[PDB]
Design a binder for this molecule. Structure first.
Ligand code: BCL
Ligand code: BCL
Ligand code: BCL
Ligand code: BCL
Ligand code: BCL
Ligand code: BCL
Ligand SMILES: CCCCCC/C=C/CCCCCCCCCC(=O)O[C@H](COC(=O)CCCCCCCCCCCCCCC)COP(=O)(O)OC[C@@H](O)CO
Ligand SMILES: CCCCCC/C=C\CCCCCCCCCC(=O)O[C@H](COC(=O)CCCCCCCCCCCCCCC)COP(=O)(O)OC[C@@H](O)CO
Ligand SMILES: CCCCCCCCCCCCCCCC(=O)OC[C@H](COP(=O)(O)OCCN)OC(=O)CCCCCCCCCCCCCCC
Ligand SMILES: CC(C)=CCC/C(C)=C/C=C/C(C)=C/C=C/C(C)=C/C=C/C=C(C)/C=C/C=C(C)/C=C/C1=C(C)CCCC1(C)C
Ligand SMILES: CCCCCCCCO[C@@H]1[C@@H](O)[C@H](O)[C@@H](CO)O[C@H]1O
Ligand SMILES: CCCCCCCCO[C@@H]1[C@@H](O)[C@H](O)[C@@H](CO)O[C@H]1O
Ligand SMILES: [Mn+2]
Lengths: 286, 50, 306, 30, 39, 32, 10, 50, 47, 39, 50, 50, 39, 50, 38, 38, 50, 38, 39, 39, 39, 39
């Protein structure tokens, strides 16, 4: 049945050549091999090029062109909104654009490399989906919303404590950001994800090294809540909630500057619906 | 079982369900009589349709 | 010696209700399990129920009083009704009019009792079956922040109005006001630690769920039997994350990462919130003295004006 | 001058698509 | 066998009647047309 | 606001929802 | 003897 | 006729897929084009300030 | 003076160093445990 | 066999009728066209 | 089982369901009569179409 | 099963679905007649295209 | 065999009809073109 | 079951899908005719190209 | 079971309904035609 | 046989299509040709 | 199965691949001619280099 | 033996195409030539 | 068996000493009490 | 057996002593009652 | 059996020395006490 | 056997040297003490 295997045999059993995306498009993968523990393929080279160039451009824009060695006092900022969607090598915001493009290339390469490694091991495509959700979050924050608004100066600056200034000013320009419905849905899903993670961790740890059967945890979760979900159901719920949390919060930030200007004036319709308008008295009107 | 219930309603009632039913319908009849009296009194006090 | 059938199908106070279990079809198709019930109703479970419903009754009746006992205005205004703690003119006093803070005091006391009794329920029902007590201590870590928000931070500040109102919109208003009052909360270092752990928890939950569903063809989700001998699904998950990141984990210690990442969030948040008013009355000025604020001498403000 | 060029390019695209569809779908299918 | 059980019919009818009684009482009280509990 | 570019970008934001919907539909169909 | 959970059960 | 894709060109299913793809592209373009033509042809220009 | 206040080290820098070092050490030990020799099902027969 | 059950149709019809009755009563009360419950 | 149901509706109904149907149909007819009377009275009070 | 269904629609309908279908189409026809009458009355009262 | 089920067709058509009826009735009420529920 | 669908379309259509298809195409043609009449009437009322 | 016919008919129905609603609400709120005017 | 003619046909066709779309988008959205607005 | 292919290109081409290749080169040359014409017309409209 | 002609063809073609696109974009963005200028 | 290992004692003591030394040097540097590293 | 182990006693006492020492130093030195490390 | 291995000692000591060198250079540069890299 | 392999030493040394070279070039260019890259 089971015996002691030293994990060298399990790694050497599953290594196969040529089952990736580039191997299916070109007929061969140019970089199909392993360096150390990592699998290098195509999209494993594009990603590393982007990573190196992005780090170099970020540090050059920070240390030079600003003259500060304090890492927590840099402002790697885009061009002003008066420049439109133009890029000029001779104007401020050029090293922000270079860094942004390199980071985009790195993230998309990471996603495609995950798809490759899923294909090699005959797995499903859940991890690329879950990572593509947050990659699309980055894309809408830095590409779609600036293009729709009309300038590259609508993206956020890449400073460590200074990108939190952009968040604050954008959230108070469209006051009140708490009253955004998609914002509320995203916050609800974040809190639920943390609660579910704590619950699953506790549940699996509480039964680990014990002379008990595998049905004790079902009785535990049915005595307390009346309902026990199952073993694949909890992991499915984890996956779905994690992805949806950011999928819903893309919409709030996109619609903040394009279709809406005020999240307090959004709710002005509620008291004007014919079912309950004109039923109160003074200070209880509307 | 289906003994005290009439033959028409046998596929729907027991003896116990028939008894509880009868109690409920008598309660509803009494409540309706009281409600009619109350609505007549309130209209005599102040009419609500003008 | 634990009889699971007796634990789930016993009568009396120390026993279960809803004894003939139900069944929901769409839960069976999506989530893989559809049986509902029975549920344990022993001692420590009636006390939570009764005290929670006492507090809820108080809150809803006060909503009705504020509206004027008009059901239509009640339905229209339900999501912006609240009961607020006594204002700042009172200190921590309890001699407050019912429509100016007494209702909040009563309801909050009952809520405290109910959450403590729920912790006791979790603990005792974990011991009654054969499992350990890890959910109870996670709930304790969660309750640390709850008692900081509702009992200890107002106590150290000296007034009851430092606590949230009971309402759908009132919690958002409390968050906004508490951030505005004590400088800027973005420059609170323990708020940074809390956000680190919260976003890490969401990331880790998504990763674990996705990688277990992706390898579920070889029954990798049976994590109880995978901690005695690991088969093809767990081997494939390990190889995937090793070839991606250069390091991986077990079917055992990944849930340790989960527990501790979810636990640290509430502890760091409680420490930050408690320090917020009592030691550092202004976080932006403190961050300026601590050298973590960027200069920004010539802002481009044409972005922030319509 | 723009509408004439747009018409020219649209005509070219339509003719090319029709020609290659006729070349593809020639003969008795199986 | 049977469309509905007697117990579910009783529970639903009783709950609906109680909710309607409360709603109508509160509407009439807050309307201000009748004297009732004033001043 | 151009209202044509904005709606294309909104369409992209909505299309980003698709793999999760497909995952739910696949789970539903494959578990009769 | 050696188990995935760090235990060494006979 | 020569072909490198016998399972698509020769079969009925492959020709159906080709035609369906072309039709889908055409319809997706046409609906958006006509919607925006109508919107910009009937909606009036904003009134300049005094 | 160019130096942060003592609260700057107490509340900001020491916790950051602790977090980074703890992450590194926890990763080292979890990867050490994961890649050792224990009971596994034989990949040849199982697949 | 049957596409729909009697129980489902009864539940749906009763719920729809109650909701429509309440909605129409609320709209007519707040419209102000009739005297009805005036102070 | 299918004894009191007419032969046309046997594939759709049962005895219990036929009885409950009849109850529901009678209730709907009575409600419609009352509703017609109420609408005529309210129109006589104040017409709502002017 | 396909005993009451006409020969043309046997591959589509069952015995009970045919009866329910007939009920639905009769309801739709009655609703259409009432809608036409209501639209003519409302136009005679106040035309909405001027 | 059958591309669509009869039950789903009935459900979709009924729901769409109810939603459209409510939408048109509220739009026409809010427009102000007819007297209807004035005063 | 392919016996009423023409031999040209047998790989693509079934017995039921053939009938449903015919219904759909008839509906599309009717809708197109009605839409053309409506657009002619509205153009005669007030032309939108000037 | 094949998916082409069902997919085509469902997407056609949804597209038609959405287009009709959008165009009607665009025409109504422009004032070019009389339609529902007070 | 190292190279398959089918693979080269597919790759070159896709590359040409992508380049045509990219060049169209770049030329149309410029100071000249101004999205044909003129 | 490759007698039509010239002896130089035997190890790379098949009988059908040779014909498809000839079609491809003809299409490429025709497209190049059309592209030259289109570029001349677009220059006559508005030069892109000044 | 670790070097195959097809893989090197793929790598060189990709690198050349990406370099050409990058140089075109940078020269267009510089504004030093009167090319596609309003 | 002894309560604690030697390795644990070494790790704990070394880590605590290094942390304390860094903290005290940075607390004394920024106070301004001594003329050390002053411009 | 004994209620507690020697190792647990050592751990609890050592951690309590260290935490108490740091807390008392912070509370006493930040009150401004003593002239320590001042410019 | 020795408590620590030679590899761990080498890694820990080398990393500590490099980190301390970098930190001290950064602090002495940012102090402004020495001329060094002034413009 | 032996503590470290040769390839790990080569990798570590080369990576550290390259990173330090880049860091020192950036710091010296940012300092402004030399007339190196000025318009
Ligand atoms: C709160 C409800 C209490 C309860 C409180 C009472 C009270 C009080 C009484 C009973 C009575 C009875 N209960 Mg009991 N009973 C309960 C639960 C049960 C259950 C059960 C399975 O749970 C059962 C089987 C019973 C059984 C019974 C019967 C044995 C007994 C006689 C009923 C009868 O014949 O009246 C037939 C029903 C009616 C005639 C309806 C009367 C209601 C009226 C009409 C409502 C308006 C009142 C108005 C002032 C008078 C009419 C005015 C109009 C103008 C005419 N009860 C619950 C726990 N029960 C009665 C008895 O005599 O005990 C020995 C009695 O007085
Ligand atoms: C919802 C409340 C109660 C309930 C309240 C009542 C009341 C009250 C009565 C019954 C009556 C009956 N109930 Mg019961 N009954 C309930 C639950 C059930 C259940 C079940 C399994 O759930 C069943 C099988 C029954 C069965 C029955 C029958 C045994 C019995 C006779 C039905 C009949 O023929 O006349 C039913 C009547 C009609 C089908 C027509 C009347 C409906 C009218 C038209 C509605 C409007 C009334 C208004 C005054 C209009 C009339 C004037 C118009 C202008 C013309 N009930 C529920 C729990 N039931 C009746 C009875 O016992 O004596 C005959 C009776 O009076
Ligand atoms: C100035 C504007 C003019 C006007 C000018 C026009 C013009 C021009 C046109 C219309 C058209 C329409 N107008 Mg008009 N119209 C005006 C005012 C109105 C008013 C009103 C209250 O004021 C209303 C209610 C309407 C209503 C209508 C509709 C009848 C029609 C929209 C067709 C549609 O929705 O297809 C969308 C629906 C579908 C695509 C789905 C169809 C499927 C059917 C409904 C069956 C579905 C159920 C079945 C089970 C399918 C489910 C399959 C499942 C997958 C199983 N108009 C004013 C006066 N109107 C259009 C038309 O097409 O005429 C026919 C049209 O061209
Ligand atoms: C007159 C003012 C506007 C204008 C206002 C409208 C309005 C309003 C509408 C259109 C619609 C259309 N217009 Mg127009 N349109 C204008 C000018 C144009 C010009 C032009 C070159 O000038 C063009 C090419 C068009 C083109 C179009 C088409 C996209 C479309 C009609 C064809 C169609 O899809 O029916 C194809 C066939 C169908 C959709 C069949 C569906 C019909 C079925 C029968 C449903 C009927 C509903 C019925 C009540 C349901 C009953 C169910 C049973 C009782 C159970 N318009 C001008 C500028 N136009 C309609 C649309 O967008 O629909 C998609 C629409 O609603
Ligand atoms: C932007 C400024 C100008 C403009 C200036 C130019 C200039 C200058 C040129 C074009 C060219 C093109 N323009 Mg332009 N163009 C403009 C406006 C338009 C408009 C419009 C709506 O007005 C249209 C429709 C077009 C359309 C076109 C295309 C006809 C053409 C792009 C070539 C191509 O697609 O190759 C991509 C296709 C391929 C690479 C091959 C794919 C198809 C092959 C032949 C067959 C399929 C093979 C497959 C493997 C078969 C196997 C079977 C499978 C199983 C299916 N233009 C504007 C007005 N345009 C070019 C041209 O005319 O060249 C011919 C050109 O030189
Ligand atoms: C004098 C000024 C302040 C004051 C400031 C302080 C400060 C500051 C401290 C105390 C501490 C104490 N104070 Mg006092 N204290 C004051 C007034 C009081 C009053 C009072 C009623 O007024 C009381 C009851 C106390 C009571 C106390 C005790 C709780 C405690 C001393 C006993 C003890 O457990 O430490 C005895 C210590 C031990 C038993 C631990 C042994 C230490 C070991 C040897 C570690 C030495 C460190 C060494 C450098 C490490 C080198 C290791 C290398 C490998 C070589 N203080 C006034 C207000 N007090 C100390 C404490 O530790 O709290 C728990 C503390 O730090
Ligand atoms: C305010 C911020 C504070 C930050 C503090 C961070 C804390 C860091 C400490 C991390 C824990 C180090 C553990 C050292 C000892 C573990 C020994 C070990 O290897 O433990 C193994 C499991 O550990 C394992 O998963 C490895 C350890 C557990 C997995 C990781 C647990 C931490 C999860 C997140 C918590 C913080 C980490 C990230 C912080 C940002 C089990 O093996 P055994 O069968 O018992 O082995 C027996 C013998 O071979 C000798 O042991
Ligand atoms: C946000 C900041 C920027 C991002 C930084 C990203 C960089 C690093 C993050 C962490 C990377 C390490 C992750 C785990 C460590 C690898 C594990 C390991 O040890 O793997 C090694 C693989 O690394 C090898 O070759 C070497 C692998 C390559 C390492 C170097 C990659 C550098 C990437 C560029 C960094 C930016 C440069 C910018 C310049 C200014 C080899 O180990 P072995 O002795 O063969 O193992 C023994 C056996 O069990 C397996 O063989
Ligand atoms: C624009 C891109 C639009 C892509 C739409 C895909 C729809 C079908 C997806 C699907 O669901 O494909 C079904 C397949 C396989 O199915 P399975 O793994 O469930 O089978 C299980 C068998 N046991 O999963 C995938 O391909 C996963 C692809 C992940 C892609 C996620 C990221 C892409 C979208 C977000 C954009 C991110 C940036 C992209 C670059 C700018
Ligand atoms: C706040 C302010 C103002 C000040 C703070 C004050 C303070 C708290 C100071 C604290 C100081 C401390 C703690 C200093 C520590 C210094 C150390 C650990 C040096 C280590 C050297 C390690 C060395 C030289 C390592 C050499 C390694 C070599 C040569 C390795 C060689 C080799 C090995 C092992 C493997 C392969 C073969 C090879 C020969 C290449
Ligand atoms: C992949 C998307 C690349 C960036 C798309 C934007 C095209 C840039 O094109 C921009 C226009 O969008 C803009 O209107 C004017 C001035 O604002 O200058 C042009 O260069
Ligand atoms: C267990 C909770 C600790 C109890 C702390 C009691 C704090 C008392 O603090 C009170 C104030 O709350 C009060 O407002 C004024 C009235 O003059 O007097 C003070 O003593
Ligand atoms: Mn798990």
């Amino acid at each position: 049945s089971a015996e002691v295997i030293p994990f060298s045999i399990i790694e050497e059993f599953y290594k196969r050549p040529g089952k990736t995306l580039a191997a299916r498009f070109f007929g061969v993968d140019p970089f199909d091999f392993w360096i150390g523990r990592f699998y290098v393929g195509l999209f494993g080279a594009i990603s590393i090029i982007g990573i190196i160039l992005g780090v170099a451009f970020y540090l050059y824009e920070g240390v030079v062109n600003e003259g500060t060695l304090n890492i927590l006092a840099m402002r790697i900022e885009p061009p002003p909104v008066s420049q439109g969607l133009n890029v000029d090598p001779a104007q401020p915001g050029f090293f922000w654009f270079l860094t942004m493009v390199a980071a985009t290339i790195a993230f998309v390469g990471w996603l495609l490399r995950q798809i490759d490694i899923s294909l090699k091991l005959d797995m499903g495509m859940e991890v690329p989906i879950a990572f593509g959700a947050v990659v699309s979050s980055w894309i809408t924050l830095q590409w779609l919303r600036p293009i729709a608004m009309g300038a590259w100066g609508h993206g956020f600056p890449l400073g460590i404590t200074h990108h939190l200034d952009w968040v604050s000013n954008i959230g108070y320009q469209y006051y009140n950001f708490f009253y955004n419905p998609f914002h509320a849905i995203g916050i609800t899903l974040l809190f639920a994800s943390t609660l579910f993670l704590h619950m699953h961790g506790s549940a699996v740890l509480s039964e680990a090294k014990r002379n008990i059967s595998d049905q004790n945890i079902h009785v535990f979760w049915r005595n307390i809540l009346g309902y026990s979900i199952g073993e694949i159901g909890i992991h499915r719920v984890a996956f779905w909630t994690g992805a949806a949390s950011v999928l819903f919060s893309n919409l709030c930030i996109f619609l903040s500057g394009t279709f809406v200007k005020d999240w307090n004036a959004f709710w002005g319709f509620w008291d004007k619906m014919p079912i309950w308008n004109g039923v109160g008295q003074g200070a209880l009107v509307a | 079982q289906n003994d005290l219930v009439p033959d028409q309603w046998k596929p729907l009632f027991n003896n116990a369900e028939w008894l509880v039913h009868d109690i409920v319908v008598k309660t509803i009849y009494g409540g309706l009589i009281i409600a009619v009296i109350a609505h007549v009194l309130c209209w005599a006090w102040t009419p609500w349709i003008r | 010696p634990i009889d699971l059938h007796d634990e789930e199908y016993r009568d009396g106070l120390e026993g279960t209700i809803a004894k003939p279990p139900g069944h929901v079809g769409w839960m069976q198709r999506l989530l893989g399990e559809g049986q509902v019930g029975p549920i344990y109703v022993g001692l420590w479970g009636v006390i939570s129920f009764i005290t929670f419903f006492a507090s809820a009754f108080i809150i809803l009746v006060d909503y009705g009083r504020q509206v004027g006992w008009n059901p239509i205005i009640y339905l229209r205004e339900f999501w912006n009704l609240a009961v607020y703690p006594p204002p700042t003119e009172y200190g921590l006093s309890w001699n407050v009019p019912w429509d100016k803070g007494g209702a909040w005091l009563a309801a909050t006391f009952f809520l405290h009792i109910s959450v403590l009794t729920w912790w006791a329920r979790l603990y005792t029902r974990a011991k009654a079956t054969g499992v350990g007590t890890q959910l109870a201590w996670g709930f304790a870590s969660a309750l640390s922040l709850y008692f900081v928000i509702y009992l200890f931070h107002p106590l150290a500040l000296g007034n009851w109005s430092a606590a949230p109102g009971h309402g759908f919109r009132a919690i958002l208003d409390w968050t906004n006001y508490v951030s505005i009052h004590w400088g800027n909360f973005y420059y609170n270092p323990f708020h940074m630690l809390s956000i680190f752990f919260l976003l890490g928890s969401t990331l880790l939950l998504a990763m674990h769920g996705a990688t277990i569903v992706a390898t579920s063809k070889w029954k990798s989700e049976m994590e109880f039997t995978e901690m005695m001998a690991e088969g093809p699904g767990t081997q494939r998950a390990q190889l995937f994350w090793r070839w991606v990141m250069g390091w991986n984990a077990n079917s055992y210690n990944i849930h340790i990462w989960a527990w501790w990442f979810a636990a640290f969030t509430a502890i760091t948040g409680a420490i930050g919130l408690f320090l917020s008013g009592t030691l550092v009355p202004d976080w932006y000025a403190w961050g300026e003295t601590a050298k973590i604020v960027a200069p920004w001498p010539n802002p481009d403000w044409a972005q922030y004006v319509f | 001058m723009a509408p004439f060029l747009m018409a020219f390019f649209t005509i070219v695209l339509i003719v090319a698509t029709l020609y290659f569809l006729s070349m593809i779908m020639s003969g008795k299918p199986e | 066998d049977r469309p509905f059980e007697f117990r579910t019919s009783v529970v639903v009818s009783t709950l609906l009647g109680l909710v309607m009684a409360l709603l109508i009482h509160f509407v009439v009280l807050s309307s201000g047309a009748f004297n009732w509990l004033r001043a | 606001m151009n209202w044509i570019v904005a709606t294309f970008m909104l369409m992209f934001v909505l299309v980003a929802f698709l793999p999760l919907v497909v995952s739910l539909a696949y789970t539903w169909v494959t578990n009769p | 003897a050696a188990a995935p959970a760090g235990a060494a059960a006979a | 006729p020569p072909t490198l894709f016998p399972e698509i060109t020769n079969t009925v299913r492959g020709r159906f897929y080709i035609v369906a793809g072309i039709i889908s592209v055409v319809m997706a373009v046409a609906s958006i084009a006509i919607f925006w033509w109508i919107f910009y042809t009937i909606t009036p220009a904003p009134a300049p300030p005094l | 003076s160019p130096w942060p206040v003592w609260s700057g080290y107490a509340l900001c820098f020491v916790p950051l160093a602790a977090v980074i070092l703890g992450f590194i050490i926890a990763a080292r030990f979890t990867d050490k445990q994961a890649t050792s020799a224990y009971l596994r099902l034989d990949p040849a027969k199982a697949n």
